[PDB]
Design a protein around this ligand. Structure first.
Ligand code: MG
Ligand code: MG
Ligand code: MG
Ligand code: MG
Ligand code: MG
Ligand code: MG
Ligand code: MG
Ligand code: MG
Ligand code: MG
Ligand code: MG
Ligand code: MG
Ligand code: MG
Ligand code: MG
Ligand code: MG
Ligand code: MG
Ligand code: MG
Ligand code: MG
Ligand code: MG
Ligand code: MG
Ligand code: MG
Ligand code: MG
Ligand code: MG
Ligand code: MG
Ligand code: MG
Ligand code: MG
Ligand code: MG
Ligand code: MG
Ligand code: MG
Ligand code: MG
Ligand code: MG
Ligand code: ZN
Lengths: 108, 306, 152, 146, 115
RNA sequence: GCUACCUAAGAACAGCUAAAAGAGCACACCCGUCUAUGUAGCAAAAUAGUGGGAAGAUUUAUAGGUAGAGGCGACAAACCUA
RNA sequence: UCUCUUACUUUUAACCAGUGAAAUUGACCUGCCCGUGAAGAGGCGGGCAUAACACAGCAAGACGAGAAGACCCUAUGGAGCU
RNA sequence: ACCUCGAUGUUGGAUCAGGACAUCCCGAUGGUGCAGCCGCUAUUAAAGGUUCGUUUGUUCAACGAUUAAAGUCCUACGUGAUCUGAGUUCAGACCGGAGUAAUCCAGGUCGGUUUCUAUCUACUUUCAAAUUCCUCCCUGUACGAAAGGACAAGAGAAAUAAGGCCUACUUCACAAAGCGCCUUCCCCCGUAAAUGAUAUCAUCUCAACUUAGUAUUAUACCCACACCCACCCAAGAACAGGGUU
């Protein structure tokens, strides 16, 4: 195929400036009760997500430091702790993984 | 600006089931209130006339079950269940087109949270829960029925040809061979990218193509009217219609069944209820199943030839 | 035309798709938290439900043992799955593996999601909590409920 | 519900497709109740005629309905290699064909390439029928009682 | 379905189909509007380099429900006018051909077994 | 230095049948009869088999010589840096 | 291969993120019929036609794109063979 | 040789069809060297088909089996920005001939690269009111000398195209198709005849009118202006379509 003429700037404007190709304005942006870093409906907040991801990464680091080599997988449940907090009576058969910081207010 | 919202947005964990149960009881009470339309204020019933028509019904296509007759042949019937069928409004002759009157009939019941404001206002003024689809039947003048009466599947009797129309299964943007049924080029006979190509579309002297040229595109997403559908069995408890043949559409969909307009079946509804089958004024209880004088009943003691 | 058909294709065929789903299932059994596209995590949850069901059905069964040995390429996860995740859901049926949607990825901007089992020693994800039962609409609904209860 | 009966009549295979629910059927009688190693005997068309040949005037054997339905573990040979379908493919799963006196080792080796070990552990494609079976059993019991 | 150029076996007791030949008899034309032949149709069969009519008494594809399904294509020879060629039919003939009774009266009479 | 020819010193060819062989099938290897993909492609000539040869008129690493009123040529007016 | 095509996977197909062409372009606010013209008109006469703007497929026309045609003819312009 | 050698791709076949009658047919007339089924002449009507195959390179041409037919012409001797060159427009060679040789053959043969991402117009269900063969009482009747067989009506089974289905057969399975199943309803202008004057008979009327003699001013899909984050879908390229009690 080969054009016989040339498209004009008016045709280009009518083709690229149509409301179909323009980005639509979404109305799903709100605020978050906690922290508040501009979230969206049906979507988790990025701030708390990053916080829990960092916490899970630290817990996995501690577990790997306690386990040592690969190919382990204990046959008992696990429970994480923080500064202080004596182990309860119903947490005897579970693996204790203590950290080195205070307990956050969003983890009970 | 105003953002999107629904019905279960600003509710707690102990209010959504309460609202669901409340609206369920409300719609059940509204459906049970419109059970005896004859004892209220019914319109005067006119006798049957040879030059008149009646209003159809709205059913739901369940499935297709085989059926046998008494002579040994095997036919095919389709299940059409009528869940909830009522009349919405009534339009006079001098307000639609000056020819024949119309009736607004709705399909099965739905929820009140996913409908328009005008629809909810209309269904509140009428007194019935909202419906999925709305159909219109062209009737005469003496067949005027008061809006708000239940319509059961017992309105039809075994021995009448009806017409069922619905939305067929869409195939989307498909090729031309599967759509219009055009033949194709050979396979491995040295063909270079032409196994499913239409080829020519017009001629070289006209300089264009005709609009009535069969070309690939969307097909199947349309309503098709089926003719010549004889009923063989009428159910009363579950309200199931046994129409012969196939129904254009998929399963669990709302159809539109009405009387036939073929010239071979002009005036054949003289032995049928012209207004609407009322289970209150009939002073009799019809059996659970109404069989035809040619279909082999399931309780037959093994028919034998002689 | 794909009416009534799921089985979202991912790899170069059914074998590659099943291998990727098995790898995702093994990773979910090990780390208990994996971020991946919505279709991948959906299929992973759909397979993990039946995996938990088969692990709860019994341990001495050869069928469940072979299925656990096939769907787990790390071996050590089989005793864990049979002695931790099976006695945990002894009171539940098929209510587990909660799915939560995350925004996008900082690489190709793809829709992803994170799923995890119930309980979980790891801190729970920020669940989209509903409104409290003290707002105007909730208080009006509670008042209407109390009114209809006292009137009945 | 239909079923096909295979039988050789005067050196000619006749296959009738009856119906379990048909008004023309008079009475269904079982001559010999027994199971086999396969749930679909569609490979009898390519087998020897002496296996699918049964006497039409045979006397039905009567037994008690508590023998757990004895299974007949009898292998059937096959005609050369102009068969009807490729029964050597693993997707059919047939354990009643003698591949030692009909096919060689190279043919089996090249036919085992279409084996799908992942299909046996698909899990999601398994149709677990238990609650529906209990429901239909309760329904048929309630219909038979009164 | 018996169409054209089909290697069919004669099941009659005549001197044409039972005689050995270096080429199997094949059909060349079907007396029907379309090119699909079912049980109870007249077709042309070339036996020993000749031109003789034939009658389909049992193909191999399953038609309706209450019908037999033969493993081999059974065809009984027939002339122009209603006079069969063979006199002994050893192969069984289905009972679906008895609904005619007018054009194949002798073919159903010279038969033996029926299914 | 790609290709035609020649010269000196080297290397390559599993396995089976090996009839004694310018024997056969067949790895690596030499050339490319056909299908399918592209002709601004991976490529100013590619991708798999169906292909012929593969103990010799076979292929190849190194070095030298034959050039236009000519070189070479198991003769295609074929090749002599797309 | 066909009567008569069909069931699935990949490349590919439709959207999102960026690098990002080549051929080609007198300008276009670019519909159809009849008739005319350098003899085959979307721009000429008479009629029919008409709110505007993108996406997804096919070729009927714009005698569409690539090679100052290799076929026919001219050249007191060449070359090969005998 | 009138635009076309700063380029108009050339015979068929597959797919796709449009228009025209100088019409093979089913619709309707008159005559016959029309005794009835087989034929011919002249008129109106295009809503369709125009087969299954062989070999020779074919649009040409040859032969086997049907019904009403295997109809004609134009659309760049229709269609290569869709497909193949079997030859036709090259470079090689072989047979025969002309020619000292070179060289050539409307004499024959073997094989002889088939490139384009759609710019513009225009298209993407126009929703629909089909056609026909055979058999059964009439039928072995009018008719001839004998062969044979209808005009018309009623009923039952069937072929092409279109509109749908998975539950029963197949492809093989939480789906989609055909090899299986249902339906398809109205005509179309050319004669045969009363009265009547012009032309007191007679006269069917490019006079005023009466009968077949115009179907139809036809009937069903589909016609609520705005709740929309998200999930699902028999809906679907995006968008759009339906449900979330
Ligand atoms: Mg094809
Ligand atoms: Mg191809
Ligand atoms: Mg090519
Ligand atoms: Mg992919
Ligand atoms: Mg077969
Ligand atoms: Mg050489
Ligand atoms: Mg050798
Ligand atoms: Mg060799
Ligand atoms: Mg030479
Ligand atoms: Mg992009
Ligand atoms: Mg001028
Ligand atoms: Mg013009
Ligand atoms: Mg122009
Ligand atoms: Mg020039
Ligand atoms: Mg001169
Ligand atoms: Mg000169
Ligand atoms: Mg000079
Ligand atoms: Mg010179
Ligand atoms: Mg000129
Ligand atoms: Mg020219
Ligand atoms: Mg030009
Ligand atoms: Mg050009
Ligand atoms: Mg005419
Ligand atoms: Mg042919
Ligand atoms: Mg042409
Ligand atoms: Mg063209
Ligand atoms: Mg091309
Ligand atoms: Mg060759
Ligand atoms: Mg476009
Ligand atoms: Mg233009
Ligand atoms: Zn937050």
């Amino acid at each position: 195929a080969a054009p016989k003429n040339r498209r004009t700037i008016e045709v280009n404007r009518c083709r690229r400036r149509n409301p179909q190709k323009l980005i639509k304005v979404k109305n799903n942006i709100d605020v978050c009760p906690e922290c508040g870093h501009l979230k969206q409906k049906h979507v988790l907040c990025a701030y708390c997500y990053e916080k829990v991801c960092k916490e899970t990464a630290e817990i996995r680091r501690q577990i790997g430091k306690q386990e040592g080599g690969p190919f382990k997988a204990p046959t008992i449940e696990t429970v994480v702790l923080y500064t202080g907090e004596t182990p309860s009576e119903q947490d005897q058969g579970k693996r204790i993984i203590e950290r080195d910081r205070k307990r956050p207010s969003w983890f009970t | 600006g105003k953002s999107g919202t629904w019905w279960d947005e600003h509710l707690s964990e102990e209010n959504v089931p309460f609202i669901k149960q409340l609206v369920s009881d409300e719609d059940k009470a509204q459906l049970a209130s419109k059970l005896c339309p004859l004892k209220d204020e019914p319109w005067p019933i006119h006798p049957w006339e040879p030059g008149s028509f009646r209003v159809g019904l709205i059913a739901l296509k369940l499935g297709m079950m085989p059926l046998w007759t008494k002579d040994g042949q095997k036919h095919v019937v389709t299940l059409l269940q009528v869940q909830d069928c009522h009349v919405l409004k009534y339009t006079s002759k001098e307000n639609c087109n000056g020819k024949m009157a119309t009736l607004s009939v709705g399909g099965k019941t739905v929820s009140r949270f996913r409908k328009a404001t005008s629809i909810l206002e209309f269904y509140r003024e009428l007194g019935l829960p909202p419906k999925q689809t709305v159909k219109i039947f062209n009737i005469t003048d003496n067949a005027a029925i008061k809006p708000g009466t239940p319509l059961y599947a017992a309105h039809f009797r075994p021995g009448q040809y009806v017409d069922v129309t619905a939305k067929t299964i869409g195939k989307g943007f498909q090729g031309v061979m599967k759509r219009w049924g055009f033949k194709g080029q050979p396979a491995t006979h040295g063909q270079t990218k032409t196994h499913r190509r239409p080829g020519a579309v017009a001629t070289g002297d006209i300089g264009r193509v005709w609009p009535g040229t069969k070309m690939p595109g969307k097909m199947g997403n349309i309503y098709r009217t089926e003719y010549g559908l004889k009923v063989w069995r009428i159910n009363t408890k579950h309200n199931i219609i046994y129409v012969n043949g196939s129904v254009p559409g998929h399963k669990n969909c709302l159809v539109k069944v009405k009387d036939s307009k073929l010239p071979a079946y002009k005036d054949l509804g003289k032995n049928l209820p012209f207004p609407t089958y009322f289970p209150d004024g009939d002073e009799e209880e019809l059996p659970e199943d109404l069989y035809d004088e040619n279909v082999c009943q399931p309780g037959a003691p093994s028919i034998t030839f002689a | 035309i794909s009416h009534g058909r799921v089985f979202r294709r991912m790899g170069l065929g059914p074998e590659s798709r099943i291998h990727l789903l098995r790898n995702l299932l093994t990773g979910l059994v090990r780390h208990e938290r994996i971020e991946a596209p919505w279709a991948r995590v959906d299929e992973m949850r759909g397979y993990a439900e039946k995996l938990i069901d088969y692990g709860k059905l019994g341990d001495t069964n050869e069928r469940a043992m072979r299925m656990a040995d096939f769907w787990l390429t790390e071996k050590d996860l089989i005793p864990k799955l049979f002695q931790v995740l099976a006695p945990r859901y002894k009171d539940q049926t098929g209510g587990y593996t909660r799915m939560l949607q995350i925004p996008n990825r900082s690489l190709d901007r793809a829709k992803m999601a994170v799923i995890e089992y119930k309980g979980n020693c790891l801190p729970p994800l920020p669940l989209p909590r509903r409104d409290s039962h003290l707002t105007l609409l909730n208080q009006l609904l509670q008042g209407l409920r109390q009114d209809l209860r006292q009137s009945q | 519900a239909t079923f096909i009966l295979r039988n050789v009549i005067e050196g000619q295979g006749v296959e009738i497709c009856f119906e379990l629910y048909n008004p023309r059927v008079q009475e269904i009688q079982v001559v010999k109740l027994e199971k086999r190693l396969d749930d679909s005997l569609l490979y009898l068309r390519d087998a020897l005629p002496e296996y699918s040949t049964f006497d039409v005037n045979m006397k039905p054997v009567v037994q008690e309905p508590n023998q757990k339905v004895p299974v007949n573990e009898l292998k059937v040979k096959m005609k050369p290699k102009p068969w009807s379908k490729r029964w050597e493919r693993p997707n059919f799963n047939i354990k009643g064909i003698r591949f030692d006196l009909c096919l060689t080792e190279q043919q089996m080796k090249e036919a085992q390439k279409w084996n799908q070990p992942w299909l046996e552990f698909d899990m999601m494609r398994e149709y677990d029928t238990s609650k529906i079976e209990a429901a239909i059993w309760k329904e048929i019991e309630a219909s038979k009682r009164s | 379905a018996i169409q054209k150029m089909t290697r069919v076996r004669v099941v009659d007791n005549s001197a044409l189909g039972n005689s050995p030949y270096h080429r199997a008899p094949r059909c060349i034309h079907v007396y029907k509007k379309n090119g699909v032949g079912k049980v109870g149709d007249q077709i042309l069969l070339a036996i020993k380099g000749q031109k003789k009519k034939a009658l389909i008494v049992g193909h191999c594809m399953p038609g309706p429900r209450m019908t037999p399904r033969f493993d081999s294509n059974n065809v009984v020879l027939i002339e122009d006018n209603g006079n069969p060629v063979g006199t002994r039919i050893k192969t069984p003939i289905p009972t679906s051909l008895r609904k005619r009774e007018g054009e194949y009266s002798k073919v159903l009479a010279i038969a033996q077994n029926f299914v």
